[PDB]
Amino acid sequence: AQGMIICNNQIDDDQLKAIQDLASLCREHDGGTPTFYNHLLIQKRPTENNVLYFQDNQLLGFLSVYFFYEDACEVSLIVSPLHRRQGIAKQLLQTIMPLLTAKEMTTLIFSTPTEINDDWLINQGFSYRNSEYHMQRNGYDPIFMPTPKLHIRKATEDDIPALCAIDEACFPEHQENMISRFSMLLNDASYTLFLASYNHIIVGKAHIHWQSKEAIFSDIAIFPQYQGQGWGGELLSYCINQALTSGKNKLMLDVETSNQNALHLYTRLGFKTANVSDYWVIPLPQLLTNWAL
Ligand SMILES: *SCCNC(=O)CCNC(=O)[C@H](O)C(C)(C)COP(=O)(O)OP(=O)(O)OC[C@H]1O[C@@H](n2cnc3c(N)ncnc32)[C@H](O)[C@@H]1OP(=O)(O)O
Ligand SMILES: CC(C)(COP(=O)(O)OP(=O)(O)OC[C@H]1O[C@@H](n2cnc3c(N)ncnc32)[C@H](O)[C@@H]1OP(=O)(O)O)[C@@H](O)C(=O)NCCC(=O)NCCS
Numbered sequence: 001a002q003g004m005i006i007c008n009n010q011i012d013d014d015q016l017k018a019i020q021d022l023a024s025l026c027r028e029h030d031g032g033t034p035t036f037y038n039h040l041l042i043q044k045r046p047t048e049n050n051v052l053y054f055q056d057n058q059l060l061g062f063l064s065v066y067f068f069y070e071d072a073c074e075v076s077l078i079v080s081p082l083h084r085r086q087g088i089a090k091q092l093l094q095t096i097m098p099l100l101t102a103k104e105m106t107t108l109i110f111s112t113p114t115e116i117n118d119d120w121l122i123n124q125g126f127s128y129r130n131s132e133y134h135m136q137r138n139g140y141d142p143i144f145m146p147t148p149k150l151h152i153r154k155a156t157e158d159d160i161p162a163l164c165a166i167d168e169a170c171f172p173e174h175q176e177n178m179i180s181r182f183s184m185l186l187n188d189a190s191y192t193l194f195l196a197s198y199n200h201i202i203v204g205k206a207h208i209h210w211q212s213k214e215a216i217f218s219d220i221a222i223f224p225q226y227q228g229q230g231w232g233g234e235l236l237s238y239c240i241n242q243a244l245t246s247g248k249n250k251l252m253l254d255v256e257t258s259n260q261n262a263l264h265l266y267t268r269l270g271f272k273t274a275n276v277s278d279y280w281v282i283p284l285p286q287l288l289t290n291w292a293l
Helices: 013-030 088-102 118-122 157-170 178-185 231-245 260-268 284-290
Strands: 003-008 050-055 059-066 072-079 107-112 127-137 151-154 191-198 201-210 214-222 250-257 272-283
Touching: 003 088, 013 050, 013 059, 013 072, 050 088, 059 088, 072 088, 088 284, 107 284, 118 127, 127 260, 157 178, 157 191, 157 201, 157 214, 191 231, 201 231, 214 231, 231 260, 250 260, 260 272, 272 284
Parallel strands: 072 107, 214 250
Antiparallel strands: 003 050, 050 059, 059 072, 107 272, 127 250, 127 272, 151 191, 191 201, 201 214
């Protein structure tokens, strides 16, 4: 008999592959997994945010907290489907709550696989917020496009006013960091900000972040006034074919949404939903009375 609880501030390489093996076992049974931020896990973070639960040399539970907002934190938590309703989740949370009360936390955000937990979550005071589709296009075949009607080019530092017009109309979350954020993106060769123009009028954009064997798509936008014309599909088509020409076949795209109709164009250019996570909110004091402290 042996139980062991490790609480640290950085996931080492072998711990990471134990965590990924446990997560894959949960994907086997749950149809999906919570959202993990691997770059944050393997980073030396200021506090002890990771909790690993072992039983006879076996990783059975894992929790990590991410401090994104001010009074809110995101929690990714998994327990071996073969060892559930044994209190492993309350043990992991008991471990982390001293850190949470010290940071003055008031609200917890849990990422969860869809459907399977809906009824007991809502019956315990959790509130659904949104969902996230982690998409991948893995085919080697390019997109065969009709007559191109857009001119598409890499944005230089001289397209900032157009980039800021696009952001103002589509990405209000960057309002007051926008010029300085663009100045760094445009002077980083691992980022390509594609500008789409129809008859010399700029109609939208899309970002590609190049990695050594992947390409990460983000910040796709067509102005609402221009969204009927087929330009969103042409722009994204062009970016896909650019990544394939560049020798990257793992194309990533993450979409936060509460309705699946925001997936129509992407799935139709060959992206598929590799994982879906739901995000539920609960007041911290309510969680520690429904779960014994
Ligand atoms: S201020 C602008 C804010 N930006 C966003 O919210 C970013 C995400 N969406 C977009 O930038 C545009 O909605 C995209 C997805 C690029 C579509 O632009 P377009 O409307 O120009 O693209 P097409 O005309 O080529 O495509 C029409 C086809 O696909 C589905 N569609 C509409 N809206 C979406 C969204 N939001 N997500 C996925 N698919 C979407 C449609 O089926 C639309 O086709 P129909 O002919 O309308 O059936
Ligand atoms: C829930 C999970 C995260 C931990 O489960 P666990 O170790 O089985 O949790 P516990 O045994 O600590 O039980 C704690 C509270 O679970 C709630 N809970 C867990 N599973 C539940 C279920 N299937 N139905 C109702 N409540 C459940 C209860 O309040 C349980 O309380 P009780 O048994 O004392 O009444 C596990 O089901 C899992 O890893 N699921 C997949 C990942 C996921 O959904 N993460 C999101 C968590 S919000």
